[PDB]
Write an enzyme that holds these catalytic residues in place. Structure first.
Site, PDB file in Angstrom:
ATOM      1  N   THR A  45       0.822  -1.208   0.000  1.00  7.08           N
ATOM      2  CA  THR A  45       0.000   0.000   0.000  1.00  7.08           C
ATOM      3  C   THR A  45       0.858   1.261   0.000  1.00  7.08           C
ATOM      4  O   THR A  45       0.659   2.161  -0.823  1.00  7.08           O
ATOM      5  CB  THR A  45      -0.930  -0.034   1.210  1.00  7.08           C
ATOM      6  OG1 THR A  45      -1.806  -1.163   1.089  1.00  7.08           O
ATOM      7  CG2 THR A  45      -1.741   1.241   1.312  1.00  7.08           C
ATOM      8  N   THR A  46       1.821   1.342   0.917  1.00  8.39           N
ATOM      9  CA  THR A  46       2.686   2.517   0.974  1.00  8.39           C
ATOM     10  C   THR A  46       3.487   2.671  -0.314  1.00  8.39           C
ATOM     11  O   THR A  46       3.758   3.796  -0.760  1.00  8.39           O
ATOM     12  CB  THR A  46       3.620   2.408   2.180  1.00  8.39           C
ATOM     13  OG1 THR A  46       2.850   2.371   3.384  1.00  8.39           O
ATOM     14  CG2 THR A  46       4.566   3.597   2.236  1.00  8.39           C
ATOM     15  N   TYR A 136      -1.378 -10.622   3.085  1.00 12.66           N
ATOM     16  CA  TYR A 136      -1.399  -9.243   3.579  1.00 12.66           C
ATOM     17  C   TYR A 136      -2.829  -8.956   4.022  1.00 12.66           C
ATOM     18  O   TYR A 136      -3.709  -8.712   3.195  1.00 12.66           O
ATOM     19  CB  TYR A 136      -0.912  -8.283   2.499  1.00 12.66           C
ATOM     20  CG  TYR A 136      -0.937  -6.800   2.841  1.00 12.66           C
ATOM     21  CD1 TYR A 136      -1.304  -6.343   4.103  1.00 12.66           C
ATOM     22  CD2 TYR A 136      -0.619  -5.861   1.871  1.00 12.66           C
ATOM     23  CE1 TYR A 136      -1.342  -4.991   4.394  1.00 12.66           C
ATOM     24  CE2 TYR A 136      -0.648  -4.511   2.151  1.00 12.66           C
ATOM     25  CZ  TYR A 136      -1.013  -4.085   3.405  1.00 12.66           C
ATOM     26  OH  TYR A 136      -1.052  -2.733   3.679  1.00 12.66           O
ATOM     27  N   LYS A 165       1.084 -10.504   7.142  1.00 18.76           N
ATOM     28  CA  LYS A 165       1.284  -9.121   7.561  1.00 18.76           C
ATOM     29  C   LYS A 165      -0.044  -8.601   8.106  1.00 18.76           C
ATOM     30  O   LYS A 165      -1.071  -8.701   7.430  1.00 18.76           O
ATOM     31  CB  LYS A 165       1.766  -8.278   6.381  1.00 18.76           C
ATOM     32  CG  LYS A 165       1.839  -6.786   6.637  1.00 18.76           C
ATOM     33  CD  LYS A 165       2.275  -6.097   5.355  1.00 18.76           C
ATOM     34  CE  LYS A 165       2.645  -4.674   5.599  1.00 18.76           C
ATOM     35  NZ  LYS A 165       1.473  -3.806   5.745  1.00 18.76           N
ATOM     36  N   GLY A 190       1.500  -4.660  11.686  1.00 25.59           N
ATOM     37  CA  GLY A 190       1.437  -3.620  10.675  1.00 25.59           C
ATOM     38  C   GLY A 190       0.924  -2.254  11.069  1.00 25.59           C
ATOM     39  O   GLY A 190       0.816  -1.381  10.191  1.00 25.59           O
ATOM     40  N   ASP A 192       1.811   0.956  12.952  1.00 24.05           N
ATOM     41  CA  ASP A 192       2.961   1.580  13.612  1.00 24.05           C
ATOM     42  C   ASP A 192       2.561   2.249  14.922  1.00 24.05           C
ATOM     43  O   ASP A 192       3.255   2.124  15.938  1.00 24.05           O
ATOM     44  CB  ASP A 192       3.605   2.635  12.705  1.00 24.05           C
ATOM     45  CG  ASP A 192       3.921   2.127  11.301  1.00 24.05           C
ATOM     46  OD1 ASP A 192       3.415   1.063  10.890  1.00 24.05           O
ATOM     47  OD2 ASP A 192       4.683   2.837  10.602  1.00 24.05           O
ATOM     48  N   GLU A 193       1.462   2.994  14.901  1.00 25.93           N
ATOM     49  CA  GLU A 193       1.053   3.798  16.043  1.00 25.93           C
ATOM     50  C   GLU A 193       0.468   2.954  17.163  1.00 25.93           C
ATOM     51  O   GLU A 193       0.152   3.494  18.231  1.00 25.93           O
ATOM     52  CB  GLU A 193       0.065   4.887  15.589  1.00 25.93           C
ATOM     53  CG  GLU A 193      -1.243   4.389  14.986  1.00 25.93           C
ATOM     54  CD  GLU A 193      -1.200   4.143  13.478  1.00 25.93           C
ATOM     55  OE1 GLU A 193      -0.112   3.886  12.914  1.00 25.93           O
ATOM     56  OE2 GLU A 193      -2.283   4.200  12.856  1.00 25.93           O
ATOM     57  N   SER A 209       5.058   2.047   7.324  1.00 25.70           N
ATOM     58  CA  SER A 209       5.511   3.157   6.499  1.00 25.70           C
ATOM     59  C   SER A 209       6.390   4.126   7.266  1.00 25.70           C
ATOM     60  O   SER A 209       7.277   4.755   6.667  1.00 25.70           O
ATOM     61  CB  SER A 209       4.312   3.918   5.929  1.00 25.70           C
ATOM     62  OG  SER A 209       3.577   4.530   6.980  1.00 25.70           O
TER      63      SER A 209
END
Lengths: 295, 295, 295, 295
Positions: A45-46, A136, A165, A190, A192-193, A209
């Site tokens: 995606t990124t 994914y 993922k 997957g 990050d935050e 990302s």
């Protein structure tokens, strides 16, 4: 061999006219290697994989192999709405020195039964049989299939299944997937935050990302977590939150691409239908990234 | 001041005919106190508050005060679709020896702007002014309002605002809410099956249905987490997962009500429209709870 | 020149191995011409356009031109998740003797603002400038953009805009679109089983999958509607409903493809990720189509 | 037996302080009778029934009986999240000279199986056994139960089942419901802005909020539709569309309440959580209603 550490999901750099700017892939790869990232999840995606043609995607994957010089675990996302395109991409990836291929859930005709998603994945994996294979899982695909049930069924028919993922906030589902087949499978995390949650729920690696431009921040967070310094983890998350706020305001792909200029790399604008940032928006985004104080 | 530890969300016990079985509240409260739970979130979702009439809810709240003998932090959920009902319940709660009142987001006419949700909460909090006030954020309400923005706006006009019960998988939003006004507010974490994630993301307390019958399991998990014993937390989560599977199969309220029989307490069936369990389903659920090995 | 009458959305026929079975396109086209259909919407959803590669889609569009011998209005759906693929397909369609091109809303990175959807469409339309251009509005894309607002904005920047294929149950939005720019645009109605509603709300044409195999039924319904025979319309809709029930049970593409055997045409199975029917399911579907009594 | 013509869903009038302004019900009822409306669907969504207490709803229903003087078919919506409230309201409605009671689908704990929704309705209908019973199907409840299957199952166990108020854009489902049990049931159509679609799909009556203040417009539209005057229907729909635009801009309940001032009736603001209109917004809405040219 399971992934470890931070795996970046790199951008695909475009020139001013929207064509692929292949030499800039060398720049991104060198930066990932230098900042402690252990791998790259390519053309996801990124990376705007679904924005590139089949021939562009083949050339991008080839450039990642040459650019990384064996220093990065490489996973090539081969997914596309057309099974013809997917299998052609998988056959090409099978010729490359990579770790694995991967497909995201088809998002138009949405599989609604486990067996239907499994058969789609089985075909893609069987066209790159000597490489690993990651499903994914992304909430962006909008599927209602339970990923533990999927992994249990896929494990019976996909002999090169490596794992999944996991791009979803469902930490309960994540923990169940980590336990399938006695912990056999690799479930890179997957979101990050959510990284403190991922670590606390058993993640061994993270794919994301923001590791393109903020990997040292997250490597510090991981060390603070392992050292029991809960205040240090929160202090790191102050900076993570500040990054995410910019992605929410301006678009994850668009703002993340701008963020690469904080390391001297111009990866261009996103491809349509994603919206590019104006010059004023780009300057505001860069200013907010700098105010986040992670560089 | 802020909550700590485990806060159960207790059931409301119904007799065979569906009437409220008030003396069984005494049994539940004694059990909660005995097992180390520090508070009770009363007449919320697990307590089927919206299934009870205004007069029933008043009597249930009164019984919790008498039954708990000052040994539990009591938060009374006063939310209802009718503002007339909500304010009548809040005025009654204001006469009780309780810690706080609370309202869930209205789920039919769904507030779509921050200020609209703030004003609804402001009215409810102002009818119980000398008690604390928690907004109950639940994904079951289906609102699209960001909870950090809500909390920032609500803090300016609700002087007895205590914080928010957080029943959502959005750990990024959770972390932002914990940071509002320099950390002023109390954000008890509401997703039992995410508890390692909540703890890692800064939770100071957890409020949930499974603490009615599996509190020692979660007290051990919290101990292991605070020690940094990552394997210990995962071993506890094996048992948490086994509990949650039964709730997914048979319904959270219905199966959790059955689970109270493992402590000798018959809280009856859910009220319609929730579906009751057959005798065969109850026996299967109890067998699965026992096999989860948390008692 | 606006469309009129029934426009079929034809299947793409696949051989046993999943390759495109080009000569069967001749069969479909001859059947459409013989049954009173006035046009074909090619490589859309029913045609599994997004399941075919760019080179397959070019060859399919070429075969439709030769097969139809100028007897069908041809609209080529060029939409794909990659703008590279879309513009390549549009450039090829510009070389063909067709009425128009068309793109569906991108369904992964979902445009959320009118201007962003307009710019995507503007690029596709400008690569086939001497042909008409229809936006394909489908609820399957999951976009939240109002189609009246879209049409008003697109009309200002897309000089070859013809209108919109309308695959949505929102009859209020449909009626507003028919009124944009004084009724300038062509809004073929896309929900077959709503056809009495479409007629009553001003539709001048209908584009749909069931006109591949049941066009005489709908031509009779239209005549009964125009003749004021409300009972005749209902009697026709008994048969339409019976058809749709089979599509719901077995899948619209899969069951519609089976239905072509009621006219001697074997268009093969759908492509993965769509699920094929077993032999038992195919026989049951054909039996239910025959019991519907429309042939 | 079955309803006919236009059934208004009237507002509940509130005084400045939010209390029920009972005498204004007399004004609304006189207006409805004068304009040719044949019935009133009381305390539904437009009537903000779920915003009123049980005692308020009893008194409102009583006032509608007295105010209407036998000249309106009265259907009392008794639905509430609490089955205790619903059955108390149904027992009270059973004492009134009304045509039927009705319940909307519970929207918090959402029934997900046909039999579960049937049993909830069965209890509500059995507490008002000598009156008819309409299920209120609304997309606002967010249920995924097919209404044809519901009606077939409900017909077997609810002996006073009259049918269903249909507030959904699914015209295919609507047509299937009209056919259940050989056409036994009454399916009044609830989507005002779809009225040409409803009529074309077999509707015998329409129930809606805009018939409170624009009934002559819709009576003319029905006349033109029954005459087959397609242009006449479209000309009427120009004005219907203009009304709906104001409801979309300012809120259906809020703007419709303002519209009652065009007939001299002040029904007050909505109750919280719905947002009231400012003085400037009220004036703009009234100006737009007047420009719609339906009075």
């Amino acid at each position: 061999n399971k992934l470890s550490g931070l795996i970046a999901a790199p951008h695909t750099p475009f020139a001013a006219d929207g064509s692929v700017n292949y030499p800039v892939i060398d720049d991104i790869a060198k930066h990932l290697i230098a900042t402690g990232v252990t791998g790259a999840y390519v053309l996801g995606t990124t990376g705007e994989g679904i924005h590139c043609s089949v021939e562009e995607r083949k050339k991008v994957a080839e450039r990642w192999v040459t650019a990384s010089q064996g220093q990065l675990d490489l996973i090539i996302h081969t997914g596309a709405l057309s099974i013809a395109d997917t299998l052609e991409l998988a056959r090409h990836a099978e010729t490359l020195d990579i770790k694995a291929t991967s497909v995201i859930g088809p998002c138009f005709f949405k599989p609604s039964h486990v067996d239907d998603l499994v058969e789609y994945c089985r075909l893609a994996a069987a066209s790159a049989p000597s490489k690993g294979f990651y499903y994914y899982h992304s909430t962006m695909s909008g599927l209602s299939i339970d990923m533990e049930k999927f992994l249990q069924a896929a494990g019976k028919v996909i002999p090169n299944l490596s794992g999944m993922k996991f791009n979803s906030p469902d930490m309960y589902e994540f923990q169940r997937c980590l336990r399938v087949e006695g912990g056999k499978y690799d479930i890179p995390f997957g979101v990050d935050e959510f990284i403190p949650a991922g670590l606390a729920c058993g993640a061994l690696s993270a794919v994301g990302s923001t590791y393109n431009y903020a990997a040292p921040l997250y490597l510090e967070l991981i060390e603070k977590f392992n050292q029991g310094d809960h205040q240090g983890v929160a202090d790191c998350m102050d900076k993570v939150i500040a990054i995410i706020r910019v992605l929410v305001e301006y678009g994850g792909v668009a703002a993340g691409k701008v963020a690469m200029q904080l390391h001297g790399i111009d990866v261009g604008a996103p491809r349509r239908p994603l919206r590019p940032l104006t010059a004023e928006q780009k300057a505001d985004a860069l200013a907010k990234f700098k105010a986040a104080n992670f560089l």
